[PDB]
Amino acid sequence: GMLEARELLCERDERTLFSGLSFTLNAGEWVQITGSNGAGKTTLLRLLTGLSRPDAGEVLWQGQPLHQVRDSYHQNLLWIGHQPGIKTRLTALENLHFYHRDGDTAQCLEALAQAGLAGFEDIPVNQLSAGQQRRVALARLWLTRATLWILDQPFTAIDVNGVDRLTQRMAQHTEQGGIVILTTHQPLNVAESKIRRISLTQ
Amino acid sequence: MGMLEARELLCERDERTLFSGLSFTLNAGEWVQITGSNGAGKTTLLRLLTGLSRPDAGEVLWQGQPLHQVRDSYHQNLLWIGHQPGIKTRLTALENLHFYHRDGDTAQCLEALAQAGLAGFEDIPVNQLSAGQQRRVALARLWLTRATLWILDQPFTAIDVNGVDRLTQRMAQHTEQGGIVILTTHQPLNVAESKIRRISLTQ
Amino acid sequence: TPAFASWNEFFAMGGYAFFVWLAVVMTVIPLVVLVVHSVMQHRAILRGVAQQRAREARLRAA
Amino acid sequence: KTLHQLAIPPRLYQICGWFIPWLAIASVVVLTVGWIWGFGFAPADYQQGNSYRIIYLHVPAAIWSMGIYASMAVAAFIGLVWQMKMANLAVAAMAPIGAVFTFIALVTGSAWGKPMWGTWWVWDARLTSELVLLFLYVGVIALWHAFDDRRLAGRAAGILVLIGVVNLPIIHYSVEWWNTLHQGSTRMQQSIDPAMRSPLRWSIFGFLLLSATLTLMRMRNLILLMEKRRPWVSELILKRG
Amino acid sequence: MFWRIFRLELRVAFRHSAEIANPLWFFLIVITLFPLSIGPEPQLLARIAPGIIWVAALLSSLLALERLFRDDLQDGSLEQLMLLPLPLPAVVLAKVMAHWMVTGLPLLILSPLVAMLLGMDVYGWQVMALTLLLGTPTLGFLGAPGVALTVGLKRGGVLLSILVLPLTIPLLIFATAAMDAASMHLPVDGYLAILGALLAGTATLSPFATAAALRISIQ
Amino acid sequence: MFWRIFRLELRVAFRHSAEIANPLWFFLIVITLFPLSIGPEPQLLARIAPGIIWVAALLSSLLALERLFRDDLQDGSLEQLMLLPLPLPAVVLAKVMAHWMVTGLPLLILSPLVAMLLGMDVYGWQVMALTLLLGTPTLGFLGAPGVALTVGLKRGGVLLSILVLPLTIPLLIFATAAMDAASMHLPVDGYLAILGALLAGTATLSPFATAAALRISIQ
Numbered sequence A: 001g002m003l004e005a006r007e008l009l010c011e012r013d014e015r016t017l018f019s020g021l022s023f024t025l026n027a028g029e030w031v032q033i034t035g036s037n038g039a040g041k042t043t044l045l046r047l048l049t050g051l052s053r054p055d056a057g058e059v060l061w062q063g064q065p066l067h068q069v070r071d072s073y074h075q076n077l078l079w080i081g082h083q084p085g086i087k088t089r090l091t092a093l094e095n096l097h098f099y100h101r102d103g104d105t106a107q108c109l110e111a112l113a114q115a116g117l118a119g120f121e122d123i124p125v126n127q128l129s130a131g132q133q134r135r136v137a138l139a140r141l142w143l144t145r146a147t148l149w150i151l152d153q154p155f156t157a158i159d160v161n162g163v164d165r166l167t168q169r170m171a172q173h174t175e176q177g178g179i180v181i182l183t184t185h186q187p188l189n190v191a192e193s194k195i196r197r198i199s200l201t202q
Numbered sequence B: 001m002g003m004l005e006a007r008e009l010l011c012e013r014d015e016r017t018l019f020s021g022l023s024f025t026l027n028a029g030e031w032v033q034i035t036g037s038n039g040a041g042k043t044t045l046l047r048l049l050t051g052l053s054r055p056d057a058g059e060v061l062w063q064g065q066p067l068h069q070v071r072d073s074y075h076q077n078l079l080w081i082g083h084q085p086g087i088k089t090r091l092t093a094l095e096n097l098h099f100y101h102r103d104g105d106t107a108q109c110l111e112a113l114a115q116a117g118l119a120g121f122e123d124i125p126v127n128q129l130s131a132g133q134q135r136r137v138a139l140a141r142l143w144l145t146r147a148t149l150w151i152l153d154q155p156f157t158a159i160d161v162n163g164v165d166r167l168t169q170r171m172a173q174h175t176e177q178g179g180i181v182i183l184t185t186h187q188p189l190n191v192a193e194s195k196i197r198r199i200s201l202t203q
Numbered sequence C: 001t002p003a004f005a006s007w008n009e010f011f012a013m014g015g016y017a018f019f020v021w022l023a024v025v026m027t028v029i030p031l032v033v034l035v036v037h038s039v040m041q042h043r044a045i046l047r048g049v050a051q052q053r054a055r056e057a058r059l060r061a062a
Numbered sequence D: 001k002t003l004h005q006l007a008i009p010p011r012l013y014q015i016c017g018w019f020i021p022w023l024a025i026a027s028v029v030v031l032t033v034g035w036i037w038g039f040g041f042a043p044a045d046y047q048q049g050n051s052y053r054i055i056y057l058h059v060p061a062a063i064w065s066m067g068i069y070a071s072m073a074v075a076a077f078i079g080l081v082w083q084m085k086m087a088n089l090a091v092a093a094m095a096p097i098g099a100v101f102t103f104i105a106l107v108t109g110s111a112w113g114k115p116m117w118g119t120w121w122v123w124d125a126r127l128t129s130e131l132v133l134l135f136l137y138v139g140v141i142a143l144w145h146a147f148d149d150r151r152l153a154g155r156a157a158g159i160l161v162l163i164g165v166v167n168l169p170i171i172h173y174s175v176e177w178w179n180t181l182h183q184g185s186t187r188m189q190q191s192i193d194p195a196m197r198s199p200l201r202w203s204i205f206g207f208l209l210l211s212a213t214l215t216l217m218r219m220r221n222l223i224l225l226m227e228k229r230r231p232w233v234s235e236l237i238l239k240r241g
Numbered sequence E, F: 001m002f003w004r005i006f007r008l009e010l011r012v013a014f015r016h017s018a019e020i021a022n023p024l025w026f027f028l029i030v031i032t033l034f035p036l037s038i039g040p041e042p043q044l045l046a047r048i049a050p051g052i053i054w055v056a057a058l059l060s061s062l063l064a065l066e067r068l069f070r071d072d073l074q075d076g077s078l079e080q081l082m083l084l085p086l087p088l089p090a091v092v093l094a095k096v097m098a099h100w101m102v103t104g105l106p107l108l109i110l111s112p113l114v115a116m117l118l119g120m121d122v123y124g125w126q127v128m129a130l131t132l133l134l135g136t137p138t139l140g141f142l143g144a145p146g147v148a149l150t151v152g153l154k155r156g157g158v159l160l161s162i163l164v165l166p167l168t169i170p171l172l173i174f175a176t177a178a179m180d181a182a183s184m185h186l187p188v189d190g191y192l193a194i195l196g197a198l199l200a201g202t203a204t205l206s207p208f209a210t211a212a213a214l215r216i217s218i219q
């Protein structure tokens, strides 16, 4: 049904990272791509979002390839990479207001308050520290209604309280049919039965 | 006496005092880890300790002298790692490490890159290197330098567990000899509480 | 058979010799450079991978 | 058939290595025959004098410069419609050959216009057009050499070549329009003679064959360079070693 | 989401007011420099003005063209801009329209002082303003694919100029011919129609290939 | 560390075996841009050569001037360059001297080709080469203080762009006047001595002030 893989071969730069991965996702999942430093767990996620063209094999979304279903795929997804994805020139409020809704107080100032950024709405971006620069893009995640969450390294420059603050929301999304694909290095405070582990096969 | 003494630091940024009157003297061979919260000054303390930022109040003392005349001796014994790696991405790893001292021949090059986990990744450009490997290139500097004072903001970020273990081992070998490492990370590093020293932010 | 009977006169290209011979040398030399360099590159890249593989075998033995 | 297995690069290397020497011998013998017959056993022009025979040294290369840009299109466009790297390497194979041919055309035109204009370079028709073609080849060279990767470099060079090929006739007509007004020029390009017009065609064929030789052997160069690790290169160097 | 993208790009261009003044002062430095360097004789100024003005406009838009896609990849906002629920060519069209509105429209606003700095007439000023209006969107559309090719590169120098300027040569020739023929009080309606046809062709072709080159440079 | 930084900046500037030709081809692009608008007559181009060559030099210098300091902020290597065991003014002098090698040495190399293209004489070519050798480092040394303040400023202003490109007035005016006075056979050493004194003043005053500006910009 949901994001599925078929014979994903992504050998490039005169080397091979992985071969023949055909993992499927159904409704209400939680996967973590496992590997080492320099094993290719971001190229896989970029190919999952459709940023990079696959060398061999295809990703499918309700049984259709990603190059014609792109409207619904982009409607029902958000992607947070290593780059923050926000403008450094503006302040936090309109950088958040770029993404969907926000605006009135029904989803404004408390999506930022829940990310630990209460009282920091009209302040420009680089007048905050890289951790809360990441927390702006993570406070985007509290006001979106996208079914497919893809997060590369969300626990980057994030406090010990911010890990639990993220993970509670992550699990709450996992209850109501939320498919999430995260790449991370810090261990989670989640039992292994809840989280699937799509390992990159060699 | 300690050769790094931070005296009466006051930092006011947009009607907020990050820290006022913070003072600590660092004796030889120890392991300060600056703690804090997201939105607290645990960078503008390391950055101010390096001399990049001028203090609003208080000052930094190196070997009994302030930081505005002993710069030539202070920059010779310091190694700073920031959030940004500080490496030219268009080159490969070899000349990026050869910018800094030693490297070159195989006595100090091709094995400091190998100890960081980048074996076979020396002549590849940093543009096609992974972000973890991009930071590993900058963090491979610890294995070839002779700098006594290391100041590393977030060293163990985007780095797998074996990399953190090797980095903590190398940092322990530097700590046993004469040398002070000041880091700031969020995850608890797998070391005993007895040797690490926590200088917390006060408000 | 040529319009210039004398061999010295053939090199004195009807009073316009220097322009024609400059054009001839500055056409001949670029093609010579384009061939010699691009075949020296072939030899050096084949020899480059050969002496790369020799060092790779030496390090595999080591 | 043979076209699908032409995509496998060891087979392409073997086919190109078979194709190089006979076609190179044919190229050099046709070029020698044309040059000898033209610069020797042939008359000259009444008006231009005895520098007239620079019509040889200019006219094939120049038109084939335009021609090889057309070849660029039937590489790059196909390399952007079946997404094939084997076609995208032909752009970087044919780029500096076209640049050298266009520089030779500019040099021969500037040297041939000297008995008339008095100055080495005057701002006339078709020489500005060749200079703009040289700039387009320079852009292809710089865009290929600037990228660190090879596949991205090939696709970017294909995009640039398609854009330049689309924009080329507009430039070709606008530079001609720049010569309709702003005074004029003499007909120094292709003023031919009835007893002269045959080794011109032979030298056109010879320069085409030489361009084919150069692009085939540079395609061999780029094929050997791009795949540094794949074991068909190991088999080839074991045959050599 | 279309006009939200346009308003956001205008806001982020006005927040970066600094790279907006260097091409404007470059147009000013060329327009000031050429007659004072050459001389105050008005016989040759009336012929040299269409050339100097439009080459200054070409190089000023070249100078401004670097901020169009360089800052977006480093902040990573382009990887999200491709992921909004509307096609990437329309995002390209909105961003290049904001590029024209933030920098090319100050050229039209300042062309009063440019015309009065070097002579001209009322009809000459009218052809000046109309040619700049018809040609600066053409220049932006023509220079968009070169910037879309040079995104992942860190080269911020002569490469974009080499890629762009031979493509914008015929726009330069036609616009200079239009202004020169207007300086002799001859009707230039056909030349303006040629410039409008060039604008329509660039509007048809440039956003369909700039997005493709941008997708090439991001993988 | 001095010559190592110089070789490093050369290594970043020229990345491949055949990459030095790009500043040479951009120059010929500008020198083919100007007669393509103004006209094909060697007489007018001989009259207006100073503005053409110096606008090409200005555009090259200001186009390559961003990569001095804007690249090093987002990379982050400028902080560790400041932490290098060597004074900041000599580091800045190495960087801007390498930048001059990116731009000024192409000027001096392509000087006879552009002297042959836009019609001039041997005395004009000699005057052009001498004043370009004496003026391109001045152009870099006056342009770098503005960029040093510009890239390290959030709040910023249009008023910060006043420090960089408006500062170009005296050198360009004096050099174009010297070329125009040397177009006719007149003595020219009186302005050449002024340009040499300007080079001495810029070489004395640029890195010392620009190092302080670089200390101000990042905090």
Ligand SMILES: Nc1ncnc2c1ncn2[C@@H]1O[C@H](COP(=O)(O)OP(=O)(O)OP(=O)(O)O)[C@@H](O)[C@H]1O
Pocket: A010, A011, A012, A013, A017, A035, A036, A037, A038, A039, A040, A041, A042, A043, A044, A052, B124, B128, B129, B130, B131, B132, B133, B158, E219
């Ligand atoms: N587009 C690409 N396609 C294939 N391989 C690539 C590509 N870009 C870089 N590589 C190579 O593959 C590895 C990069 O893969 P990738 O960056 O996805 O790993 P990674 O998971 O990001 O590493 P980390 O987990 O530390 O982030 C590097 O060894 C690099 O040389």
Ligand SMILES: Nc1ncnc2c1ncn2[C@@H]1O[C@H](COP(=O)(O)OP(=O)(O)OP(=O)(O)O)[C@@H](O)[C@H]1O
Pocket: A126, A127, A128, A129, A130, A131, A132, A157, B013, B018, B036, B037, B038, B039, B040, B041, B042, B043, B044, B045, F219
């Ligand atoms: N130069 C500055 N730039 C931006 N913000 C600053 C600066 N100086 C002080 N601040 C403010 O001071 C606070 C602390 O800044 P700092 O960057 O030191 O936090 P940090 O310790 O780096 O946070 P993190 O743990 O995420 O790195 C921030 O909330 C920020 O708003």
Ligand SMILES: [Mg+2]
Pocket: A041, A042, A043, A082, A152, B130, B131, B132
């Ligand atoms: Mg990654």
Ligand SMILES: [Mg+2]
Pocket: A129, A130, B042, B043, B083, B153
């Ligand atoms: Mg920090």
